[PDB]
Design a protein around this nucleic acid. Structure first.
Ligand code: SAH
Length: 327
DNA sequence: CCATGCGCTGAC
DNA sequence: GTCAGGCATGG
């Protein structure tokens, strides 16, 4: 994550729904905002959140009376994406994990925050012939919000990961916000190799498969793209090896393969998974952030999470818009 | 709970 | 054709 000198969101209150690791919290707090409520139902996510922020999020949002939620200015929600991902069944709103947006809508209707700030997978914009996104837009419009949606790739915002997500920013109509812009992409100057731990700290992550097939030469020149170097097995998910001189493939939460959740990388002549701290860095988490004691849960958590830096630029622009109030 | 081989998908 | 992006089942 980056340093934010001008605290655009000072004095504003936010809630952290589907909190996970608290990526939205780190991003908005860096812009000066104050968290007043958090909600997350996974036992291990609750633990890591408490380890980092000192508080246990409330559980199952579907059973929370929306009237009990504190007054707030910005509602944040990176809501579940399994039902919308191209790696899943794409049942969408028909999936029990696919109806959480309607809980967001229920809370917005009651609490009427200035801003609603949501994140999901890129496929959310395409799913069901665009109807899924249109449902969200229309729901927010019906609640008297404007709707701004764009897919952003983390590699365009200083983080070496291909991670294309949809970001949906909504302003209450009475605020007359007409100048919200998504942040402009800029040149990437950091690559996977720049975020790696020393070899001595990751020896246990080395995998030596005799069915490794190298399909492409290692590169010496860094590049802002994924660079496949080889495969093991049949080369499905988690069975693909990439160059550290490129960017990381997207981290996953429920993924498998021998290099599960992180993918495999060529490091000093050997192939290995990423360490959870390398996952944190690939998601823009600061080294001060405390990783969950279970490595399996840590990988799941980072796989579900948000890239802090992207959220910081967006949050800064939300604040920039709210603050422009000429006579 | 933790581990891993898929077996498809959207987008080229 | 290519490549990046959760489910099922094993224990
Ligand atoms: N009914 C529910 N109540 C509370 N949390 C829920 C929920 N259904 C799913 N979730 C949680 O919603 C999260 C979506 S992933 C969100 C990750 C978060 N943005 C971060 O910064 O890490 C998951 O952690 C999942 O456990």
């Amino acid at each position: 994550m980056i340093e934010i000198k001008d605290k655009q969101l000072t004095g504003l209150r936010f809630i952290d729904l589907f909190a996970g690791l608290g990526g939205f919290r780190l991003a908005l707090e860096s812009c000066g905002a104050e968290c007043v409520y958090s909600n997350e139902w996974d036992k291990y996510a609750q633990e890591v959140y408490e380890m980092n922020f000192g508080e246990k999020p409330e559980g199952d949002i579907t059973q929370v009376n929306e009237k009990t939620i504190p007054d707030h200015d910005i509602l944040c929600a990176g809501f579940p994406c399994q039902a919308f991902s191209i790696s899943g069944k794409q049942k969408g709103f028909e999936d029990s994990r696919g109806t959480l947006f309607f809980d967001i809508a229920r809370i917005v209707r009651e609490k009427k925050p200035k801003v609603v700030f949501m994140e999901n997978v890129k496929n959310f914009a395409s799913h069901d012939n665009g109807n899924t996104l249109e449902v969200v837009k229309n729901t927010m419009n019906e609640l008297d919000y404007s709707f701004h949606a764009k897919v952003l790739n983390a590699l365009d915002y200083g983080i070496p990961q291909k991670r294309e997500r949809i970001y949906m920013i909504c302003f209450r109509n009475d605020l007359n916000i007409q100048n919200f812009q998504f942040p402009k992409p800029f040149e990437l100057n950091t690559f996977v190799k720049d975020l790696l731990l020393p070899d001595s700290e990751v020896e246990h992550l080395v995998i030596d498969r005799k069915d490794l097939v190298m399909t492409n030469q290692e590169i010496e020149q860094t590049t802002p793209k994924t660079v496949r170097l080889g495969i093991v097995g049949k080369g499905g998910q988690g069975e693909r090896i990439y160059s550290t001189r490129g960017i990381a493939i997207t981290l996953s939460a429920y993924g498998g393969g021998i290099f599960a959740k992180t993918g495999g990388y060529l490091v000093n002549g050997k192939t290995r998974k990423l360490h959870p701290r390398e996952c944190a860095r690939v998601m823009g988490y600061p080294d001060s952030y405390k990783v969950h004691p279970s490595t399996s849960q840590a990988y799941k958590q980072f796989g579900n999470s948000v890239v802090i830096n992207v959220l910081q630029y967006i949050a800064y622009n939300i604040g920039s818009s709210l603050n422009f109030k000429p006579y």
